[PDB]
Amino acid sequence: KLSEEQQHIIAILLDAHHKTYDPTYADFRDFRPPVRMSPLSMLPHLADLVSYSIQKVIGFAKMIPGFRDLTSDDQIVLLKSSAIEVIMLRSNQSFTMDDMSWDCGSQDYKYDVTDVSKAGHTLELIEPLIKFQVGLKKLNLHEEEHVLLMAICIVSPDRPGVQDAKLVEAIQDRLSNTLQTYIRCRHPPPGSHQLYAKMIQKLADLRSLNEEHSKQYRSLSFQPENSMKLTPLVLEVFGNE
């Protein structure tokens, strides 16, 4: 059985996600507009989408049970290293295998491979990112599993610069155990086959995506004319030490 504490963890994470993820994508109107006619025409829009998403990921992270017991230093390290991975994870909710795109409610806000190419990223990132999105979709995760996976992603003790690794691991383990118990109690066969193992493999995939994104971000942001198109928060999270 799920203990009362594990039920509590799931309830909090579900609510946390509901309060930081608007499935009507209403705030997207406030971004610099998408331009699809190179020039890097989709950079301003997608920089804004990333920057917005970092803010939401932070607001989610703050609500993870136990995250509050960490020092601000370790909070910072964990969010800086995980932000791009959690954006990739949370984006799965908009991703559709119908046409391999992220569909955020209208044609203006529907992003395919070519749109992502127009923000300065190459297929070395984009092809594995799409493959990641497909594999994750095909897991058909319950919202409960999805929010737990994002929370486990964030509280990872192996991130460079973590000072109190044991406390981070303890926090993570509580979430991992909740996830494993949830799958056993609430996810019916056959969907549940090796489900936990497959979810953890996604976290490994995310490390490789993170590293490639970092390489490409370093390249993109080296030119002051592209850096100019980013946001202050993106420059701080992706660029600072």
Binding site: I58, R68, I76, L233, E236, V237, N240
Partner: peptide, 11 residues
């Protein structure tokens, strides 16, 4: 330094 992240993370 991460003043924006620290701000957003604040209680």
């Amino acid at each position: 330094n991460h003043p924006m992240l620290m701000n957003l993370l604040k209680d």
